[PDB]
């Protein structure tokens, strides 16, 4: 998906007709499509599939890093399954967003 | 009156956040040819998909109760 401009993304959601995937990943682009940086990962085996720790808690040291979870990956519901990614979820300094340029850059995507 | 098409986008939307509630205010769409039965408020943290409250067409304001502090 190309927006063609810098947007401060709050969420990325997907409503499925078929069952939700066992492994899915959200990617963003700072430049207008040249290089890609991961945003969020969803898998049963975060280690084996996306080389990320399973159910990793959000670190204050790096909030600009994509995190992997087994949440929202369940086969049930086989229809109508939803995956909504909150960009500022769990991020420790999200409360003081206006003064945090680190998270201001994290929400940015073209 | 008119059920041949899907209702038009509403004209305005205004929120007012409190300690544990959010006062939502709105105005119906400009087009009257397409009949409107009501309004559907969709709220939640990060995404609006968390919960859905359906109200009648006469309603113009609604306060979303039982919410988290910050």
Q: Which of A91, A14, A84 is nearest to A59 (CA)?
A: A91
Would you give the distance in Å from CA A47 to the centre of its chain?
A: 16
CATH code, B35: 2.60.40.10
- Per-residue tokens: A5: 């401009």
Spatial separation of the C-alpha atoms in residues A11 and A89, rounded to whole Å: 10
State which residues form the domain around B41. Answer: 12-70
Cβ-count burial A76-105 (b if 16+ within 10 Å, e if not): eeeeebebbbbbbeebeebeebeebeebee
The resolution, in angstroms to one decimal, equals 6.0
Report if residue B59 sits inside a domain: yes
Experimental method: cryo-EM
What A46-51 contacts at long range (C-beta under 8 Å, 24+ apart), as own/partner pairs, is: A46/A70, A49/A23, A50/A23, A50/A25
Report if residue B3 sits inside a domain: no
- All residues of chain B having their beta carbon less than 8 Å from the beta carbon of residue A11 are 46-47
A59 vs B: CB within 8 A: no
Report if residue B56 sits inside a domain: yes
Report if residue B1 sits inside a domain: no
Contact predicate A46/A52, CB 8 Å: yes
* Residue A19 half-sphere exposure toward CB, CA atoms < 13 A: 9
Alpha carbon distances (Å) from A107 to A11, B17, B63 = 9, 22, 29
CA distance, residue A89 to nearest chain B CA (Å): 7
Q: How many domains does chain B have?
A: 1
Report if residue B34 sits inside a domain: yes
């Amino acid at each position: 998906l190309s927006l063609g401009k810098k947007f401060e993304v709050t969420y990325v959601s997907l409503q499925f007709c078929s069952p939700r995937p066992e492994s899915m990943a959200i990617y963003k682009s700072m430049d207008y499509g040249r290089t890609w940086v991961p945003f969020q990962f969803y898998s049963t085996q975060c280690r084996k599939m996306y080389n990320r720790p399973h159910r990793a808690p959000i670190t204050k040291q790096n909030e600009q890093e994509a995190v992997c979870t087994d949440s929202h990956t369940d086969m049930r519901p086989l229809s109508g399954g939803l995956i909504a990614f909150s960009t500022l979820d769990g991020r420790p300094s999200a409360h003081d967003f206006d003064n945090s340029p680190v998270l201001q850059d994290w929400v940015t995507a073209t | 009156t008119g059920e041949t098409r899907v209702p038009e986008v509403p004209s305005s939307l205004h929120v007012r956040p409190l300690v544990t509630s959010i006062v939502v205010s709105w105005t119906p769409p400009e087009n009257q040819n397409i009949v409107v039965r009501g309004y559907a408020i969709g709220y939640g943290i990060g995404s609006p998909h968390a919960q859905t409250i359906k109200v009648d067409y006469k309603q113009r304001y609604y306060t979303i109760e039982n919410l988290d502090p910050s």
